[PDB]
Amino acid sequence: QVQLKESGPGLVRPSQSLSLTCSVTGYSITSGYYWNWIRQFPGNKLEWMGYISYDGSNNYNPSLKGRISITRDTSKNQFFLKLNSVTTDDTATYYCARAYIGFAYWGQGTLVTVSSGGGGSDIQMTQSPSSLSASVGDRVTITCRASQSVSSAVAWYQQKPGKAPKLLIYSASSLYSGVPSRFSGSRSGTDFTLTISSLQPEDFATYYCQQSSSSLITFGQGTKVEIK
Amino acid sequence: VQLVESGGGLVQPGGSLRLSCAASGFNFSSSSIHWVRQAPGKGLEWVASISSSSGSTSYADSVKGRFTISADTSKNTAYLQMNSLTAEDTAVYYCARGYYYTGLWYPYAMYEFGMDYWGQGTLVTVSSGGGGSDIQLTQSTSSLPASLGDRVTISCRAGQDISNHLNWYQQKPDGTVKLLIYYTSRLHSGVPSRFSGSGSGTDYSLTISNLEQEDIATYFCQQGNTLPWTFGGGSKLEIK
Amino acid sequence: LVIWINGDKGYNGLAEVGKKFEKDTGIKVTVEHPDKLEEKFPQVAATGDGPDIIFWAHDRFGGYAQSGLLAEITPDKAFQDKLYPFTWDAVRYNGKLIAYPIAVEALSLIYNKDLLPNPPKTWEEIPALDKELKAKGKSALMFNLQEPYFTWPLIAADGGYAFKYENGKYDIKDVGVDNAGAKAGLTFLVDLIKNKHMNADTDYSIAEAAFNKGETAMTINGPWAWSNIDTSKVNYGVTVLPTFKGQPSKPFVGVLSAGINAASPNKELAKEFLENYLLTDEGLEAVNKDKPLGAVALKSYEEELAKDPRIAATMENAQKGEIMPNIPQMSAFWYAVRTAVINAASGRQTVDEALKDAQT
């Protein structure tokens, strides 16, 4: 009976193409059924990516249309995944599977990692907390940790819904002209803190850190400060 | 000082689009122009930049090879050419001026960097497409440790009616995946009778009549009612 | 010949000199301006690759020289006389010449001619000038106080220095940060803050915005800033920095220099290109017409460019300034002096305590 087996490189660089092969034995991919690719992200979530059917027709997940191709070689009884312009988000265990009602037969899965070289240019900002309940008059503290040293090339921005972000702080601790003095910033090694000394009703917003040490500028994930 | 984006609109997956950013009120020739985007309900993502004085360009890894940023100093305008667009590229695209000066001493770093001026943004929508949208599946009790003879029940709730097209999978620690139940209650070949499934409409359930050691695993539900097929988040079984 | 020069320089002008060289000698010259050039160079040169000639600010070449990536150059004493003598000190490492000086850059006094048609010759005049201008809703002087590169011209005026330079080398243990001259200069600067003539928080963007909007009569800045002033339509001039205790301000000097890859097999060709094609009136003009070089090390062509008084000011402040040392210990100098000025100007430490801690 049917067996499926994935093969291909286990490491791909960001912006390159990820290519995987599923070798099917015991049943011809031209006889019937749908021949699928499915991936499992590091946090265990599963995503159906697409299929090629027994007649060569395709159907792809809308989240991937435009950069995914599933093809086949009927003479080798193999079908293929090609995922273009990958990012670290495509780090996952890739499975092939035969389906009709459900995915009744699965390959064993193969881990593909997407990761830059990438050295001093490769800097993340980890912002916390993601969300903060606060009251008028509270002291609010938002932190951001750089994945490696960024010197003091850190800026903080405020964004309200439907509007462009506004600059608050630059060079970690310099208040941008016209910004109220209740806003301040500070640095401790790789830790950056934005402080609102006494929160005001116009301060409910999302705040973002940003590093410009690498020419690959990056933002933190943002902190939403939320009213009752 | 102001920045005006244009060029946004609705585009087919895999299509192309060219954005412009018309600037005024500052010396364009000595500035840097940055494109920053924001996908619906998500955070700011820096995408590309160009230095007018040096001509140097930089790109986020997420757009490298697909986007090209350029600038015509005489028109005081910057451009972002975007290719091979997918749903991951849907977003409001902002252009911003990066203010800074460059150190005159090694290592010639940037100082006082800030995106002090921003445009209003231009919306780029990649259509879907013509596919369906995700039906959400929510599992529980995810990760509830029981004892080695207990009856155990895992539940799945779909965000809309899926007409009993609900399947259950078992994933072992080694990553191996097996189909257990399909079409709500039908046992796949080889699966022990101590597994059963129930439900209809939006609410479904998987029950193990008596837990054995080989049942230690993560269990997933999956709807086959509409494309794209979607999974639940998984429920891990542990032993007490 | 493969040549590397930064993208903000007149690299198409440089390629025209390369075309004349090819026309007279048959040798092709290819000019490239890769990103992060100054970082790529030591990586490919250690292989034995990279360009034959690299153009960069002189202070970077000390690292390349320590790694043995730059050839010792052999200009005649007749050729050396064609350039301002002080520029040859910028391209020396362990006493050896390792690059040709091209251009010269230094801070100057920039002033608003509508507010201040006759700018002060001495730092000591500025307090009374500020009182006058404050009464008109203006200020006398605003410049970047956060980075020691900008405050050093005043601190060094009366005797401070970073590292003692003698013969062709730096005594990395003869540091002039806490002598009486540097104490005098920082004291005068801190007093300017205590007397509210300047603000300890003033940085580059704050001073630039105030000068270019006409709110302050003077700033201190380099040639890289002029074109934003041109845009702002402030009627400005550029002049020699004020003296302190009768001594000229001593801004750090950067010298755009041309070094020859130690692994080049074309060293005699690179020498001919630089000495007889680039470092001529016609060569420097071709580069300058593409993107201005500022003040140049070649006496004959600088005399022509200095018909622009802004460029004459740049060269005059540079001749009076301190060549930026090309040694790795400058990095400790920047961090230490930066803290010293912040602490002295905020009041956390006395001038004496702050400079003494930095010297250590």
Author numbering:
A (entry chain L): 1 to 228
B (entry chain H): 2 to 241
C (entry chain A): 7 to 366
The authors write:
Diabodies are among the smallest of these bispecific antibodies. They are constructed by connecting heavy-chain variable fragments (VH) and light-chain variable fragments (VL) with short “GGGGS” peptide linkers. In order to investigate the structural flexibility of the Fv interfaces of diabodies, we have determined the crystal structures of 10 mono- and bi-specific diabodies with and without bound antigens.
We determined the structures of three monospecific and three bispecific diabodies by substituting the arginine at position 83 with other amino acids. This highly flexible linker is harmful for crystallization and was removed by thrombin cleavage after the protein had been produced. The structures of the bispecific diabodies were determined in complex with bound protein ligands.
